[PDB]
Amino acid sequence: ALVFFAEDCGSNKCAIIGLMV
Amino acid sequence: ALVFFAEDCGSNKCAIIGLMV
Amino acid sequence: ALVFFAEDCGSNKCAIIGLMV
Asked: How does strand B2-9 pair with strand A14-20?
């Protein structure tokens, strides 16, 4: 599968997450 | 929001950008 | 063009690939 990269950002706090397809 | 990352490339050069959703 | 990035995962190997738009 492919894993794209995003940051999940909220109230001045970001965390990297994968989005798997 | 989610922030994805892309290299935005012109003829000679590339910059990293966030694409925010 | 924009180049996005993904980890392409097979049975064992994982490599980062670009994806161009």
From this structure: unpaired
